[PDB]
């Protein structure tokens, strides 16, 4: 099958309406991939320990947050990961879906590898390189259907496939965490100089050691140029994702109080009846009156989260994740889990930009009703008295354990049986799409890194690597390795299907839509999604869930 | 399928007579094509701005007509366009059809690509080049069936395939217009020096930006050496094209006036009855008499067109097209839309000719009854008096708005409900054959650039390009691109079918036929269509619609 | 008076790479498309200005 | 949005722009291929170039 293609390139997004507002979005994605031989032929147990006593080391006082120490199993295999919005839709698609649909769900996933080509490189004189075809050479493929091997979402480290169809990409090298004891003590710059920082890493433990190899756990297919490989279709079992945001906060839940009379002019206000004589209910029985702020609501929309909370286990210190909610007027970023990420040119960064530094963006939850304005928050002693003297009210300013900047809001946890909140927004195009659930008896109500969590087993990971291309001289009992310089290219097609539903339209007023404009320096300027004079592209994160929706 | 051909070369024109004068002309065309890799791997938004203050720039006073500024989307794809008479018939065929047929219509179109070959180039020492086969390499093909992408008739810029079967050709690179604001002010050489010329180009607009990619809109087929690709048959839906010209002008419509007596000798004239006593009708009731010139005719054959009218939109100034009619005795070229075009050696120019300059030819409408002799035209004030004093008649000489060379005929529009005219002539071999209709609610009664306009959807455009042939070292996060030097060759066969009808023959006198002769320096000298001592060819535009036909 | 007017309409295709121009509303004071124009006043005064249409561009040839 | 100036095959640029701020140039008017309806001048230009039809038109006002 040498001179015949084994597949079809297709990167078009097709919409099929079944009627009644239901839509079958079928996203085809194809890319040309490049795979080079592994630097090492075997599996390595690598360790990373940044315990320098200067700069961003862990030995310098107060540098816990900079910790990067861990151990990993480095494998000669590579992973083909397309789990990221940017791989399947072009900007316009995302816009169209966000502006017209109100619901979206995963349906099925399929992939195939085809048109494999393997080449060898040899030298010449002047020295120039020459490229030849190794027709008989092959490429190894493996598919972990049952997810035996460690799950490693490439989207988390901007290592998925490129978001540009006409540009080539490459698979990310496979590696996974290995257990290793890790202890690091807490210190501050103010902390005494004589104080010694404990920075330790231990030996591999029997109770937690897990070394897996692709060779020993999965069946492997060999692909020569005339071969091709298919995964067959996988069926998703996940919950629908709302494509709208909520705005009603506790202050907007239920029957608004009855105004006494209609405003007298277009600029006037209206007044309610006296607090003392108004009907209603409160949960503070020390005061005989009702007020929008004291009034009993059905439940609590949103909640206070501990920030910037760091916890520690055998592995080391780590920042506890927080539910991405609205950052409010006050713009309390860390308190409401805003997410900031850095990515490469393959995933959005302007191709024109130069320097090692990646592009960075901070994602602020679309929803406006579940965030928390730490500044304006406060707790009043009871029996409650209004107004309260400084000794019967704890607020932002007040300091905990005599620390100027540590306020109660930093360690306050408001989560409770009455807490209700929306689901994290999907992030085009850098966002991860689906995720494997944690194998623990008691699971989390959601994940921060992805909108769709597989209730059952998630689609299996696709692994590839070049077959060792040996030379004429080879000795097994020698650690020395000689291999012919080889590399390969091949195409990848994937088919992701969604089930989506068109939105209803009942408000009298026009609704907020995701648009583009011509105003210079505007975030939504058309010029950002067009090519430059030399073809440089730029794909910034797009808004989503533009349309508002009743919460109650 | 390495060592086996995947198609057949065929460039013969076959005539099948079904009887009753109906003919099925099946034109087979085949060419060997050459495709090199694109200079750039991606899509570019290129701009052209000739705003120099010297020479043919737009900044120099009175140089509007020289404007070339515009913006375009440059793509790494190439287009295979065979939409031009020269691709399907050899001179003799065209002659035979023009001399014997009276009607011609498009029936069906089919095409295929086959016998693909891809080669790589490497260096050597002395340095010489070496060519090798990349058996596993492939070529990309895409067919836009629904005409989603911008229609770009290659015939308009002499970029279709070559008109010589035994000579190789290459596809034209694909590119399309992109919206960009453009303003240019009007000035004349006489115009004051201090006067400043406004020459502006704006930023991409949100309301009119359309960036398409082949990858995202069409399914793409990969062709390795042993593969081949077919379009299947497309059926045309167009109106028939008359292969005759008309000669009757308003002066020859209807009952000629009755002569009083037959001429007395072979050199004598005959006379009609006195104007004052002749029967008939006119539309000028100030004079009591009829005359061939005043006499009422059924309708108006031909009409006055504004020339050389330039109009302006956001895009810029442009020459308004005009219906190609007869240029009359007076030879008023621009007033009757004569078409002049410049073409290369691949499309007619004498191969022997040397210099960058292309060959140029001016096409004068075959029809002799719808043109306008601006010089002899005139308007008479009414009530009409004959003869008219200089103040009651506007003629050529008179100047508009005190401008010596601007005469009324320059801005006069005679088009009206009574206007009737023939269809533009087909032009062998440089002429375009069919054309896509404009997607506007109210369409034009015809196109100037083509005789056949598709009532429905036109045949889709055929796109090709080489697959990026990567090297051993590749980095995605780098803007740097390294590719192996590659190029390819492949054959293209096309089958175009026409339905034509043999002409009737009723005149007593022999009729005008398209012939060839031996008279030196004659436009129709046989020597022009023969090869030179070293094989240099020359294919000049051939006459068409030689036979005259009754108009009424 | 009750009236019933029926239309037959077709959903649009989406093929451009770049996001397309949409008719939107905003919060910028004194903007022609400010939300406040389509809401009632404190005493119920309404205001309905002409809305844009045919926002999406389309190939002509 | 396409006006007479944006109808058909754009002229072929000689080379791709050298930088993100540069322009590209076409081949000399005198040597460029194409067609016009003004046969007094031996050259083609976006403004003189023959288009299929006339989009829009002048109205008496
Ligand atoms: Cl799968
Ligand atoms: Cl076709
Ligand atoms: Na913050
Ligand atoms: Na003329």
UniProtKB/Swiss-Prot annotation, chains A, B:
Mg(2+) binds at residue 146. GO terms for molecular function: metal ion binding; structural molecule activity. Keywords: Capsid protein, Clathrin-mediated endocytosis of virus by host, Cytoplasmic inwards viral transport, Host nucleus, Host-virus interaction, Magnesium, Metal-binding, Microtubular inwards viral transport, T=1 icosahedral capsid protein, Viral attachment to host cell, Viral penetration into host cytoplasm, Viral penetration into host nucleus, Viral penetration via permeabilization of host membrane, Virion, Virus endocytosis by host, Virus entry into host cell. The keyword Cell division does not apply. GO terms for cellular component: host cell; host cell nucleus; T=1 icosahedral viral capsid. Its main location: virion. GO terms for biological process: clathrin-dependent endocytosis of virus by host cell; microtubule-dependent intracellular transport of viral material towards nucleus; symbiont entry into host cell via permeabilization of host membrane; viral penetration into host nucleus; virion attachment to host cell. It comes from the Viruses. It is found in: Virion; Host nucleus. The N-terminus of VP1 is sequestered within the mature capsid. It contains a phospholipase A2-like region and putative nuclear localization signals. Belongs to the parvoviridae capsid protein family. Capsid protein self-assembles to form an icosahedral capsid with a T=1 symmetry, about 22 nm in diameter, and consisting of 60 copies of two size variants of the capsid proteins, VP1 and VP2, which differ by the presence of an N-terminal extension in the minor protein VP1. The capsid encapsulates the genomic ssDNA. Capsid proteins are responsible for the attachment to host cell receptors. This attachment induces virion internalization predominantly through clathrin-dependent endocytosis. This is Capsid protein VP1. It comes from Hamster parvovirus H1. The chain holds residues 180 to 734 of 734 of the full protein.
From Swiss-Prot, chain D:
Transmembrane segments: none annotated. Signal peptide: none annotated. It is found in: Virion; Host nucleus. Belongs to the parvoviridae capsid protein family. Capsid protein self-assembles to form an icosahedral capsid with a T=1 symmetry, about 22 nm in diameter, and consisting of 60 copies of two size variants of the capsid proteins, VP1 and VP2, which differ by the presence of an N-terminal extension in the minor protein VP1. The capsid encapsulates the genomic ssDNA. Capsid proteins are responsible for the attachment to host cell receptors. This attachment induces virion internalization predominantly through clathrin-dependent endocytosis. The N-terminus of VP1 is sequestered within the mature capsid. It contains a phospholipase A2-like region and putative nuclear localization signals. This is Capsid protein VP1.
């Amino acid at each position: 099958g040498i001179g015949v293609s084994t597949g079809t390139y297709d990167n078009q997004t097709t919409y099929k309406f079944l009627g009644d507002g239901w839509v079958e979005i079928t996203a085809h994605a194809s890319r040309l991939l490049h795979l080079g031989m592994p630097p090492s032929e075997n599996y390595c147990r690598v360790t990373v320990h940044n315990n320098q006593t200067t700069g961003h080391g862990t030995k310098v006082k107060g540098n816990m947050a900079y910790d990067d120490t861990h151990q990993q199993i480095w494998t000669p295999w590579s992973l083909v990961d397309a789990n990221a919005w940017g791989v399947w839709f072009q900007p316009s698609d995302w816009q169209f879906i966000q502006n017209s649909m109100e619901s979206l769900n995963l349906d099925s996933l399929s992939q195939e590898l085809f048109n494999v080509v393997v080449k060898t490189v040899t030298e010449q004189q002047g020295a120039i390189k020459v490229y030849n075809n190794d027709l008989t050479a092959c490429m190894m493929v493996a598919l972990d259907s049952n997810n035996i091997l460690p799950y490693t979402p490439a989207a988390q480290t901007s290592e998925t496939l490129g978001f540009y169809p006409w540009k080539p990409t490459a698979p990310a090298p496979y590696r996974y965490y290995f257990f290793m004891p890790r202890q690091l003590s807490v210190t501050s710059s103010n902390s005494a100089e004589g104080t010694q920082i404990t920075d330790t890493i231990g030996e591999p433990q029997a109770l937690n050691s897990q070394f897996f190899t692709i060779e020993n756990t999965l069946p492997i297919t060999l692909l020569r140029t005339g071969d091709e490989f298919t995964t067959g279709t996988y069926i998703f079992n996940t919950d629908p994702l709302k494509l709208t945001h909520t705005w009603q906060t506790n202050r907007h839940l239920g029957m608004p109080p009855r105004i006494t009379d209609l405003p007298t002019s277009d600029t006037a206000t209206a007044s309610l009846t006296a607090n003392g004589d108004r009907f209603g209910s409160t949960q503070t029985q020390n005061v005989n009156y009702v007020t929008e702020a004291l009034r009993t609501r059905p439940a609590q929309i949103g909640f206070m989260q501990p920030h910037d909370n760091f916890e520690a286990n055998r592995g080391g210190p780590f920042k506890v994740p927080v539910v991405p909610l609205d950052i409010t007027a006050g713009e309390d970023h860390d308190a409401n889990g805003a997410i900031r990420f850095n990515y490469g040119k393959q995933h959005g960064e302007d191709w024109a930009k130069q320097g090692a530094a990646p592009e960075r963006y901070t994602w602020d939850a679309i929803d406006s009703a579940a965030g928390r304005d730490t500044a304006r928050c406060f707790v009043q002693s009871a029996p409650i008295s209004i107004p309260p003297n400084q000794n019967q009210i704890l607020q932002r300013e007040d300091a905990i354990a005599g620390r100027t900047n540590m306020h109660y809001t930093n360690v306050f946890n408001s989560y409770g049986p009455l807490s209700a909140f929306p689901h994290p927004d999907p992030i085009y195009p850098n966002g991860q799409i689906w995720d494997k659930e944690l194998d623990l008896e008691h699971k989390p109500r959601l994940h921060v890194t992805a909108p769709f969590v597989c209730k059952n087993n998630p689609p299996g990971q696709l692994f590839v690597r070049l077959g060792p291309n040996l030379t004429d001289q080879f000795d097994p009992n020698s650690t020395t390795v000689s291999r012919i310089v080889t590399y390969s290219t091949f195409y990848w097609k994937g088919i992701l299907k969604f089930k989506a539903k068109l939105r209803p339209n009942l408000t009298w007023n026009p609704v907020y839509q995701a648009t583009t404009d011509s105003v210079a320096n505007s975030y939504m300027n058309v010029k950002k999604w067009l090519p430059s004079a030399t073809g440089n592209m730029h794909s910034d994160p797009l808004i989503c869930r533009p349309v508002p929706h009743m919460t109650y």
